[PDB]
Write a protein that binds this ligand. Structure first.
Ligand code: HEM
Ligand SMILES: Cc1ccc(S(=O)(=O)N(C)c2ccnn2-c2ccccc2)cc1
Length: 462
């Protein structure tokens, strides 16, 4: 049946001159207007079928789930991850790592001390670190990145760290630097451009270094976890993992397999959560009435005394619509993470051969013009009915959908709820600039939309 149409394949180096590296998503849309929902693009002689719009995206990711459940190959990760872990693994190895991870990352999947409990504990430490800024102007980047990294640590090693902890610092930096240096609009760039490896050998050297620091950091906590292991009472990810390695015969589960899975979790759950939080505060600065209506709902449903908790979310339709609207507005991963077909598939009246790269435009869904009238305008009303009640949307897909859908989806959502309610409970946000002169436009560095730099003061309220 042949591959889908698209910007006529220029011999050798594909469509680079036709793409805007600064906003690749904007180009996929400029192409959908002229070729429809499903089209093909070239980076080299390697094709990439783009799925644009909810219909094409849901059909592929959902209805044709296992057919698209593959991950595109990346040389730098193939070296570091060795085809293991969760994010870039495939088939058997992936199937097993993902299911174990979904089972272990449930709110009450690692003992009596739940995930919510670990998040609440962290949200308390967060408020303190903000209070230590003495209400003086500051850039929240550093501390809004410490909190999510700590949530992950407690979930994995059953232990959090101090923001002044030397080791923890090197780790956050290593995790940031690696996403910052690897940051590119399309991840397949690396596999479609080998000469890039010869022009800049140092890039990969730094990546491997950080990757190995991250590995050793994780490996150390693992060796000492083995000694204190209680087979009947697993307190974290490692513990459950170390137990799966015993009386259960699985060669897929080894110490190395664990280290790589934990790196993936850190890598996938730190920067994304952090950036969303940074972007959250910024949007609350840009739209202070929203920040005030959240504070109103917080005072009314939680009060000024106790720490917020997940039960509150159901009773806080407005705050929830705010969190949904932030995730939807920022479009954290415009083009999702790259997929690939696992078998030859007939996508409608097209033919897609096993291994072909796939790219789903989440921006097309999240910003659907009909599902969200005025999709480029930030408005909590998108997730609120006429009675002020929370209103779900099939188009709310910031975490993707299908067999590959984010695995830390619950843990991230709990983080955004607890952290944002706790901050607006104890603080008022003050900007040096007035709202109309504040830039909120995203600069898509890599596969992650990052918010412009900014400072503010956290004014304690009591
Ligand atoms: C606001 C925060 C987050 C957002 C917006 C986000 C979103 C996403 C998206 C869009 C994907 C790709 C899905 C696909 O392949 O189609 C993804 C995958 C994944 N995320 Fe997240 N994520 C966030 C946080 C987390 C957290 C906190 C963790 C871990 C504790 C995590 C773990 C991962 C992993 C491991 C995958 C790969 C799953 C697989 O390939 O089967 N994420 N996430
Ligand atoms: C959801 C998600 C998965 C994977 C990545 S990544 O940039 O490919 N990666 C796993 C990552 C993020 C931070 N560090 N790393 C990393 C760690 C070790 C080696 C290579 C990359 C980013 C986001």
């Amino acid at each position: 049946g042949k591959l889908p149409p698209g910007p006529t394949p220029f011999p050798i180096i594909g469509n680079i001159l036709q793409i805007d590296a600064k906003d690749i998503s904007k180009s996929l849309t400029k192409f959908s207007e002229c070729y429809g929902p499903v089209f093909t693009v070239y980076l080299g002689m390697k094709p990439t079928v783009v799925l644009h719009g909810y219909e094409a995206v849901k059909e592929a990711l959902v209805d044709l789930g296992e057919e698209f459940a593959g991950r595109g190959s990346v040389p730098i990760l193939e070296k570091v991850s060795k085809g293991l872990g969760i994010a870039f693994s495939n088939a058997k190895t992936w199937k097993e790592m993902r299911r174990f991870s979904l089972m272990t990352l449930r709110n009450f999947g690692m003992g009596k001390r739940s995930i919510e409990d670990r998040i609440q504990e962290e949200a308390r430490c967060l408020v303190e670190e903000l209070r230590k800024t003495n209400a003086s102007p500051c850039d929240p980047t550093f501390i809004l990145g410490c909190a999510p990294c700590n949530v992950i640590c407690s979930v994995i090693f059953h232990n959090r760290f101090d923001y002044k902890d030397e080791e923890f610092l090197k780790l956050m930096e290593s995790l940031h630097e690696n996403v910052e240096l690897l940051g590119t609009p399309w991840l397949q760039v690396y596999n479609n451009f080998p000469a890039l490896l010869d022009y800049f050998p140092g890039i990969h050297k730094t990546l491997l270094k950080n990757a190995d620091y991250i590995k050793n950091f994780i490996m150390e906590k693992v060796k000492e976890h083995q000694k204190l292991l209680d087979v009947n009472n697993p307190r974290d990810f490692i513990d459950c993992f170390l137990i799966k390695m015993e009386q259960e015969n699985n060669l897929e589960f080894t110490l190395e397999s664990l280290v790589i899975a934990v790196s993936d979790l850190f890598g996938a759950g730190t920067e994304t959560t952090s950036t969303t939080l940074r972007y959250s505060l910024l949007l609350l600065l840009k739209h202070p009435e929203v920040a005030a209506r959240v504070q109103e709902e917080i005072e009314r449903v939680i009060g000024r005394h106790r720490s917020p908790c997940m039960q509150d979310r159901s009773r806080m339709p407005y705050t929830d619509a705010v969190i949904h609207e932030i995730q939807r507005f920022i479009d954290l991963l415009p083009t999702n993470l790259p997929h690939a077909v696992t078998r030859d598939v007939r996508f409608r009246n097209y033919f897609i051969p096993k291994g072909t790269d796939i790219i789903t435009s989440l921006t097309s869904v999240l910003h659907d013009e009909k599902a969200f009238p005025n999709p480029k305008v930030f408005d909590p009303g998108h997730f609120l009915d006429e009675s002020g009640n929370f209103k779900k949307s099939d188009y709310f897909m910031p975490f993707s959908a299908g067999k590959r859908m984010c695995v830390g989806e619950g843990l991230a959502r709990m983080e955004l709820f607890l952290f944002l309610t706790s901050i607006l409970q104890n603080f008022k946000l003050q900007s040096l600039v007035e709202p109309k002169d504040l830039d909120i436009t995203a600069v898509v560095n890599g596969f992650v939309s990052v918010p412009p730099s900014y400072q503010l003061c956290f004014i304690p309220i009591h």
